[PDB]
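Batch 3, record 17
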Amino acid sequence: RKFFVGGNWKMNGDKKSLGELIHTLNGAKLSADTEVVCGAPSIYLDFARQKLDAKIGVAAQNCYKVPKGAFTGEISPAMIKDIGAAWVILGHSERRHVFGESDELIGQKVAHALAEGLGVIACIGEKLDEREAGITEKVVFEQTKAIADNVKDWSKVVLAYEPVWAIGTGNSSTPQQAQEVHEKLRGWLKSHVSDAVAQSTRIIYGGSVTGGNCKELASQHDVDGFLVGGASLKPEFVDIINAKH
Amino acid sequence: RKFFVGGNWKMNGDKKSLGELIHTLNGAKLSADTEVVCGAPSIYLDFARQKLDAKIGVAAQNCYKVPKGAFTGEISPAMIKDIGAAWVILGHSERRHVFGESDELIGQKVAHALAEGLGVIACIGEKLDEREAGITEKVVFEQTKAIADNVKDWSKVVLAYEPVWAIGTGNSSTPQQAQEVHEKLRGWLKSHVSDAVAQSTRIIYGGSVTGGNCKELASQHDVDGFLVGGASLKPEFVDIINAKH
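Prediction for the assembled complex:
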């Protein structure tokens, strides 16, 4: 399983600052066997794919579930590929919990994105109240199933476990905490899809990943890399790409 | 009051087909006294502004309510300006009724967009069940109020009345239905803002505007132009821009 690091830029940047960000990435010393993907704001996807080195992938931060139609403000996979990008992040915590995106809708987006030839970083995660009541597993299993029912081919899917309480808070999951969820998620894929899919599917951690904490998380058996928010806008994104070196 | 025609491309097009659409519009004989604005998908906003002639405006189809932050999938007015565009469509029917955007959220977006220096096309409109229950006035007044509460300066605001039952359905408002509402909306601006704002604010109609029905809609005293969806993608958008001549 190849180590995978996505950078979710979220709603940040302009052409100048993202140009500097990209320029630094392009000239940085990166471990050759990290698969790197940068999720840019939709308004800069075209710019980002033109400027970023071709061996670094580009992800839309969201999309809708048909190629075209009367959905003011939405973009489709067809548009994302037209721009040269090959990934989309779906089901991100902010889409679910600020913008009310349901499991059903996310599963539809996953099915469509994959049929259109995109790769998907599919995000799941529990809220603090769910963790404390002891349902972490039931919650991420329910979310993963709603994704898995819409995945016919896992080659181009990466699951992203991000506890909601870890996103942007400075409170990352402990290495042990992430490992136990990733292990359970991989056991879920083994039981519900196949053994081949469990052993080949990347499950990446996200939630306040930094240069200072990435090494210990990445040495965990079932953590396959990271989805990185805040630190993806910083030079230390490079150290996270190189978390195993 | 200057006649105003916006075209909302919605989730349609790629670089090739929009490049063709833009080329035709650029070359078309357009009435010089029509203010024209095209609402491009976010992924193509930069491309659209490069390609469209400067006398045609470019609108984002939606935006968020702060300049930056942890809002995966969103774009800000600062990003819209960075790309050279000066408008945004807010509170569109699809945002409200497909994507659950509330009056309070649209209001905060309106305040922020205007403070950042954008123009806003603020959309309102009742649903079929609301019209059929005799409640049209109450719904559009409530919607208009939530916009007005967040507008200090109306110079760069256009109000767009688009009853939801007319959007995309082929079932336009009649000239008389539309006039009855526009007239009430203008009277609302008169009583709750000022006479000056009532006589100077464009209130445009939208909902299945076509080449064949636009002239009779535009000659109504209080219809000041159009927000055009599906016909914005066709040659007849030219005829709608020329509705007064």
